[PDB]
Amino acid sequence: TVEPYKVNLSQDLEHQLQNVIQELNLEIVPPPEDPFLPVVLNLGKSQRQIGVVPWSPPQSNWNPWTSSNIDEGPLAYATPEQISMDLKNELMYQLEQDHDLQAILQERELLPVKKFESEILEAISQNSVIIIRGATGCGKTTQVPQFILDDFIQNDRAAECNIVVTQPRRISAVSVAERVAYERGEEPGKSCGYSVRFESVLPRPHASIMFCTVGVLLRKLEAGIRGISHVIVDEIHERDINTDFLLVVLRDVVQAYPEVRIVLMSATIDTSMFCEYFFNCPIIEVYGRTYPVQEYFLEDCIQMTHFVPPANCNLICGDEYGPETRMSMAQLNEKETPFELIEALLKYIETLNVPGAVLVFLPGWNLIYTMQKHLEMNPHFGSHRYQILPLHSQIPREEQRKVFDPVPSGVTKVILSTNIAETSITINDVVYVIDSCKQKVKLFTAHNNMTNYATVWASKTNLEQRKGRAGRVRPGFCFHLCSRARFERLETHMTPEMFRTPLHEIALSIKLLRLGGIGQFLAKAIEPPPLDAVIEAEHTLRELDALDANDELTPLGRILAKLPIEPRFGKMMIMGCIFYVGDAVCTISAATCFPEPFISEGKRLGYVHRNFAGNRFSDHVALLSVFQAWDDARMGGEEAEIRFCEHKRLNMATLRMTWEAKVQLKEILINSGFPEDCLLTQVFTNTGPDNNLDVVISLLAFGVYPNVCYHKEKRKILTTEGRNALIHKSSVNCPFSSQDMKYPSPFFVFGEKIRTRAISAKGMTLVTPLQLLLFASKKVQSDGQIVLVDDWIRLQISHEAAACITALRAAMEALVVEVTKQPNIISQLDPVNEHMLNMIRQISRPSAAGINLMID
Ligand SMILES: Nc1nc2c(ncn2[C@@H]2O[C@H](COP(=O)(O)OP(=O)(O)O)[C@@H](O)[C@H]2O)c(=O)[nH]1
Ligand SMILES: [Mg+2]
């Protein structure tokens, strides 16, 4: 129930728009005769239709990690025998001389998996595929790759060994590589290395192990699996979607190329499904010292602590529990975690007088931080008695290492962890587990473009796994914070990611690797995705013109497939290159893969952070401005950079990683034939007239579509669906206090539409109505005076302007198509296209929509 917004467009500009449309002979939909018969302004707009990824074994003059020949140095002509012997002698000498390494090796030899060394190696040698199955903490991840390598080293065949190990997490690929390297008396870069999105330390070319994320490996596979003897797929039980996807690829590989070795490694689950998939391959069981764990539930926890709090399975409770327990539990909301009970449980654990670390499973960083703050508010849980350590993805690896370290006696180590500590890493000296019984999952619904970082129930399997983390040292205890009635209503297994994740990126991968049809290939998965997700992916890619009508990969699609970024941002980056603002658009795109550099602590931004925004009412401009300032401060060396980040309360690691990501995105564009000149760093002002920045904001609107909203008053905004929503507290556009903001336009585009208790728009950038029509709208209807954008908002603007702007969008799309066929035309672009681009440049300006940002 909102009146149409009145767009102040001058006669001069309206005529200029018409002239450009006329000069380029672009089709325009004429005005309607009857005002109750509205006309759609939206203008309309090949190759020939199961491949297998090739494999080849290691050879001496090939570097499989850089995917290039070894020409220079002695390794170009050296025989395998020479290489093998030199490495064997090097290693033998190291073991003789290094006492600290001897001690480290002695620890290795006591790991449960050590017993099974000969059996594993035997199995792998005799079979194209095996499964290694055993409890978490046995040493599958860290030892099995070493066992394989050392077997080849010690039998004079070091040169014939190159191992890829996939991990479902970035943090695991890096951390395992550093752990294994340490276990071999090295830094990463010698026998071990890693490769994640936008960061790698490559190992030596021979007798080497590479730990990587699945996405990294897949992007490399368009040239085949070249010079690799073993592919180890780790933690298959997590049902990471990219892992599931890779298993499909590998099954075809191993059938056509049975000399390759595949090793799938799994926790204690039913692996029948995987076994049958890979031609009833062997299962090698691994086990060690298991202690019994006494498990408790919310009833038990409340009773032994005497805790009293300030569909619903907390209303159900057995008769064998007392009336106050029933009463207490019946007050607890299941959607929350009882923080005060966890506090109470920690105190109860002290009275047992058996020392040991406590591991607390919490869904995400929010509840870890909430729990951590809660404890440090009580002096009881101070340095003298307690060492409370967070464990999640985004803490520095320095802090992550501290969870393994021992504490001075009398101090209790408490680890507030995500599910990383469920099956991927094992914290030693754990005797007590407190389990939220929750998981954190990212749900996305395409229809409304809604993101939900949802707190959901864990599975019975998860609870069993979490319970087992208390029983590696001595008889332990596990405090589940769900009712005994709730437990019964838990699913046995989590929904695999394949069932609940968008597939457009996997779809591009399928096409880049020439594996055939998208639906056809995914139908062969171990558990295929639902039909609707496939249709949504196909639709998404057709809309982008990544696929043609025949669903074959266009030049545009090929580029998007090579960019490790959301395809739509990939397209935004291409458009950025065309407008010669490639660097800024690569920066926006890179930043989506990392947390916010602003250390805001979940509060409203302060003065310093807000100032980066200038007068643009834009979180994206703020981001770009911190990168400009940060890069300037780096001129004066590391300490100047450190002090800048500390003074401005910025995460320096985030900035550095984002920068490196940007560099690589540029690299891929360069190699795709885009000119260097369209990707240069360009100084900008965030206060004064800046047409480069105007255009970036226009392209951002395209990037984040369909996320556009309309400001009503205060924090309340209207979404594409017509629903009410809030400006996120972290935005520069969120009012610091009670003083209202005077936006010169009510329209904003934003990065994420998030569902919690309300609908939130996060990462918000003001745009003009002209930018809305140009890049933030698919469907536009006009009655001659009023225009209806995607059936949610109305503009009072001339028919002709709206129609011309719609044609600009169409013309821009056509140019993008041409540019992807031949990217070098960017630098030598004909006048007719420059005319079209210049018109977009003009309507990107605030002044085009009657706005002057320098005047309040
Ligand atoms: N101190 C320490 N121990 C580690 C580290 N990474 C792994 N471990 C230990 O190595 C052993 C085997 O772990 P891992 O290979 O992950 O076992 P998996 O669960 O079978 O994959 C366990 O005792 C772990 O605690 C680390 O970074 N530091
Ligand atoms: Mg493991």
Q: Mapped to the 3 state alphabet, what secondary structure does 701-748 carry?
A: HHHHCCCEEEEEECCEEECCCCCEEEECCCCCCCCCCCCCCCCCCCEE
Choose one of 420, 426, 427 to mutate for the ligand 1 pocket test, by most ligand atoms within 8 angstroms of C-beta.
Answer: 426
User: How far apart, in whole angstroms, are the C-alpha atoms of residue 219 and residue 222?
Assistant: 7
- Of 418, 455, 488, 420, the residue nearest 337 (C-alpha): 455
Instruction: Tell how strand 199-201 and strand 192-196 pair up.
Output: antiparallel
Closest C-alpha residue for ligand 1 atom 5: 179
HSE, side-chain direction, 13 A CA sphere, residue 847: 9
User: How far apart, in whole angstroms, are the C-alpha atoms of residue 332 and residue 314?
Assistant: 7
Is residue 276 within 8 Å of residue 247, measured between CB atoms?
A: no
Q: Which spans in 545-606 are helix H?
A: 555-562, 567-578, 582-591
Q: How many CB atoms lie within 10 A of CB 446?
A: 16
User: How far apart, in whole angstroms, are the C-alpha atoms of residue 665 and residue 561?
Assistant: 12
Closest C-alpha residue for ligand 1 atom 22: 137
Q: How far is the CA of 240 from the centre of ligand 2 (A)?
A: 14
Instruction: Give the C-alpha distances (Å, rounded to integers) separating 89 from 92, 145, 154, 155, 190.
Output: 5, 20, 9, 12, 15
Judged by DSSP in three states, 554 sits in: coil
β-sheet bridge partners, residue 412 = 386
Q: Which spans in 499-545 are helix H?
A: 504-512, 518-522, 531-544
User: How far apart, in whole angstroms, are the C-alpha atoms of residue 785 and residue 773?
Assistant: 15
For residue 580, how far is the Cα from the chain centroid?
A: 28
- Of 408, 411, 346, 334, the residue nearest 372 (C-alpha): 346
- Of 142, 265, 264, the residue nearest 209 (C-alpha): 142
- Of 5, 9, 202, the residue nearest 798 (C-alpha): 9
Ligand showing the shortest atom-to-Cα distance for residue 180: 1
Is residue 557 within 8 Å of residue 543, measured between CB atoms?
A: no
C-alpha torsion angle, residues 478, 481, 482, 487 (rounded to 10): -10
Is residue 793 within 8 Å of residue 718, measured between CB atoms?
A: yes
Is residue 293 within 8 Å of residue 476, measured between CB atoms?
A: yes
Q: How far is the CA of 801 from the centre of ligand 2 (A)?
A: 60
563: which 2 tokens? 């960019």
Q: How far is the CA of 270 from the centre of ligand 1 (A)?
A: 23
Q: Taking the CA atoms of 20, 23, 29 and 33 in sequence, report the sign of the dihedral they define.
A: positive
156 φ/ψ sector (left φ>0, alpha ψ -120 to 50, else beta): left
- Of 333, 319, 342, the residue nearest 434 (C-alpha): 342
Closest C-alpha residue for ligand 1 atom 23: 137
User: How far apart, in whole angstroms, are the C-alpha atoms of residue 792 and residue 383?
Assistant: 55
For residue 310, how far is the Cα from the chain centroid?
A: 38
User: How far apart, in whole angstroms, are the C-alpha atoms of residue 254 and residue 642?
Assistant: 49
433 φ/ψ sector (left φ>0, alpha ψ -120 to 50, else beta): beta
150: which 2 tokens? 């050392």
The resolution, in Å, is 2.4
Q: Taking the CA atoms of 594, 404, 480 and 374 in sequence, report the sign of the dihedral they define.
A: negative
- Ligand 1 closest atom vs CA 140: 20
Buried b / exposed e over 823-834, threshold 16 CB at 10 Å, is bebbeeeeeebe
- Of 553, 582, 790, 779, the residue nearest 680 (C-alpha): 582
Which residues lie closer than 8 Å to 373 by C-beta, 6 or more apart? Answer: none
Element of type H or E holding 40: strand 39-40
Is residue 704 within 8 Å of residue 766, measured between CB atoms?
A: no
Q: How far is the CA of 575 from the centre of ligand 2 (A)?
A: 42
Is residue 748 within 8 Å of residue 708, measured between CB atoms?
A: yes
> DSSP label at 134?
E
Q: How far is the CA of 459 from the centre of ligand 2 (A)?
A: 20
- Ligand 1 closest atom vs CA 234: 21
Please classify residue 621 by burial: count the beta carbons closer than 10 Å to its beta carbon, then call 0-12 exposed, 13-18 middle and 19+ buried.
Answer: buried
Q: Taking the CA atoms of 150, 151, 156 and 162 in sequence, report the sign of the dihedral they define.
A: negative
Instruction: Give the C-alpha distances (Å, rounded to integers) separating 364 from 112, 440, 442, 526, 651.
Output: 31, 6, 11, 29, 19
Is residue 236 within 8 Å of residue 167, measured between CB atoms?
A: no
Q: Which residue spans within 128-207 are E strands per DSSP?
A: 129-134, 162-167, 192-196, 199-201
User: How far apart, in whole angstroms, are the C-alpha atoms of residue 258 and residue 128?
Assistant: 6
Domains of the chain: 55-286 (3.40.50.300), 293-448+455-498 (3.40.50.300)
Q: How far is the CA of 205 from the centre of ligand 1 (A)?
A: 26
Which residues lie closer than 8 Å to 603 by C-beta, 6 or more apart? Answer: 729
Is residue 375 within 8 Å of residue 386, measured between CB atoms?
A: yes
540: which 2 tokens? 């998404």
For residue 323, how far is the Cα from the chain centroid?
A: 47
Closest C-alpha residue for ligand 1 atom 25: 426
Ligand showing the shortest atom-to-Cα distance for residue 137: 1
User: How far apart, in whole angstroms, are the C-alpha atoms of residue 411 and residue 120?
Assistant: 40
Is residue 32 within 8 Å of residue 39, measured between CB atoms?
A: yes
> DSSP label at 173?
H
> DSSP label at 458?
P
71: which 2 tokens? 């020409």
- Of 449, 380, 446, 381, the residue nearest 416 (C-alpha): 381
C-alpha torsion angle, residues 533, 539, 545, 548 (rounded to 10): 100
Instruction: Give the C-alpha distances (Å, rounded to integers) separating 526 from 74, 234, 273, 505, 515.
Output: 45, 16, 7, 19, 16
- Of 588, 556, 582, 596, the residue nearest 814 (C-alpha): 556
472: which 2 tokens? 């590696």
Closest C-alpha residue for ligand 1 atom 27: 179
Closest C-alpha residue for ligand 1 atom 6: 179
User: How far apart, in whole angstroms, are the C-alpha atoms of residue 774 and residue 801?
Assistant: 11
User: How far apart, in whole angstroms, are the C-alpha atoms of residue 397 and residue 389?
Assistant: 13
Q: How far is the CA of 422 from the centre of ligand 2 (A)?
A: 10
321: which 2 tokens? 């529990």
Instruction: Give the C-alpha distances (Å, rounded to integers) separating 199 from 168, 509, 623, 657, 792.
Output: 16, 20, 21, 8, 42
Buried b / exposed e over 548-583, threshold 16 CB at 10 Å, is eeebebbbbbbbbbbbbbbbbbbbbbbbbbbbbbbb
Residues with CB under 6 A from ligand 1: 111, 136-143, 179, 404, 426, 428
Tokens 């980040």, located at residue: 645
Ligand showing the shortest atom-to-Cα distance for residue 143: 1
> DSSP label at 279?
T
> DSSP label at 228?
-
Q: How far is the CA of 113 from the centre of ligand 2 (A)?
A: 11
Is residue 250 within 8 Å of residue 258, measured between CB atoms?
A: no
Judged by DSSP in three states, 627 sits in: helix
- Of 695, 699, 753, the residue nearest 726 (C-alpha): 753
* DSSP-assigned letters across all residues of 384-405: TTEEEEEESTTS-HHHHHTTTS
Tokens 């600290």, located at residue: 100
Q: Taking the CA atoms of 288, 289, 292 and 298 in sequence, report the sign of the dihedral they define.
A: negative
CA angle 262–267–272, rounded 5-degree value: 65
- Ligand 1 closest atom vs CA 179: 27
- Ligand 1 closest atom vs CA 175: 27
Q: How far is the CA of 141 from the centre of ligand 1 (A)?
A: 8
End-to-end CA distance of the chain: 28
Instruction: Give the C-alpha distances (Å, rounded to integers) separating 188 from 171, 180, 210, 219, 396.
Output: 15, 9, 10, 22, 17
Closest C-alpha residue for ligand 1 atom 8: 426
